[PDB]
Amino acid sequence: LLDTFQGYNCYSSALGEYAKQKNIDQVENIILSQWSFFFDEEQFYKNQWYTGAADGPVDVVLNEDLRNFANIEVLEHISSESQAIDEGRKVLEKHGLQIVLMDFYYMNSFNWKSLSRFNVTREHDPHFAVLTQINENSVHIINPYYHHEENMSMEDFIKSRNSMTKQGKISFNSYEIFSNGTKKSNIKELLYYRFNRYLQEKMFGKITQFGQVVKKQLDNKDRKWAFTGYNCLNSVVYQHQNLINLQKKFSLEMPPNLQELLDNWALIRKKLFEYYSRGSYNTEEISNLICKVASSEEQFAQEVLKVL
Ligand code: NA
């Protein structure tokens, strides 16, 4: 396990890791001060990632934050098999790193056997990685979200970048952090804007919506939603941990229950994974935990604005 920038999702992890290694200001703090929740009932039924901090794979709200606060643009480069590796060589020669979108079917990000899950289903899911080396027959990629690295055959790497996925066709997509005129933001300004937006957009109500949809799964013999939800909600745990770390680094005023809320989300994740794998009939219990944390998060956001 590498000491990679965690961010709160694969996209923000890759952007932050790049910024960390290349000394690009503001990107890390804008990521670490995100405060967000979404729920898409239509994605729930298609077994797509349907909740957590942000829709993806690209975090468009984070891109808007990066433009608004730092005048930083994350440029999407599409390419072709004829040009992509050569463009990669030019980017590595200049910058040493390239942010790429890859089909994670073709790599082994996370050790499921750590949670006693041995039936590790391969899925055509797009995730972000950082390319660090191009050799003749192989590449080295860092998966900062999962703290993993691997060497991949050039054949496999090319397949991972031209693949049809659940969320659409990858075409050698790469992502360039760019600015023609940067801006500095203070951490309290970033948090103020995020917490006001969280309350204005009633993001806590999307947690209640999620809880209500969980209550309605009592008769659903397909428990895959609970696994997807488990994976989706790591982003929320990471935001809570990131805010705890910001509190410490910047000696911030926080409401006193931030750790309790992190614990509440970790317990919801544990119960979702146990429901998925252990055949319990506790959708009502999990629904009740989610609806409880929704109320707690609304109050927490109000209190952050009072004390920040
Ligand atoms: Na991802």
Domain ranges of the chain: 10-32+73-178, 187-307
Bond into 57 cis (ω within 30): yes
Is residue 62 a contact partner of residue 103, using CB atoms and an 8 Å limit?
no
10 Å Cβ neighbour count for 162?
Answer: 16
**Cβ within 8 Å of residue 133, ≥6 positions away:** 92, 139, 140
**What DSSP designation does 251 have?**
T
Experimental approach was X-ray
Q: Are 137 and 85 within 8 A, CB to CB?
A: no
Helix (H) or strand (E) segment spanning residue 164? strand 164-165
How many A from CA of 14 to the centre of ligand 1?
A: 10
Residue 4 to residues 10, 37, 48, 277, Cα–Cα distance (Å): 11, 24, 26, 29
Cα(308) to ligand 1 centroid in Å equals: 31
Cα–Cα separations (whole angstroms), residue 48 to 13, 43, 246: 20, 5, 31
Residues in CB range of 37: below 8 A, 6 or more apart: 51, 52, 53, 198, 203, 204, 206, 207, 236, 297
For 263, the token pair is 């614990």
C-alpha of residue 16 to centroid of ligand 1, in Å:
14
Interval between CA 41 and ligand 1 midpoint (Å): 19
Q: How far is the CA of 47 from the centre of ligand 1 (A)?
A: 15
CA of 261 relative to ligand 1 center, distance in Å: 24
Q: Which of 264, 249, 252 is nearest to 297 (CA)?
A: 264
CA of 56 to the centre of ligand 1 (A): 7
The span from the CA of 223 to the CA of 227, in Å, is: 7
Q: How far is the CA of 259 from the centre of ligand 1 (A)?
A: 25
> What does the longest C-alpha to C-alpha distance in the chain come to?
57
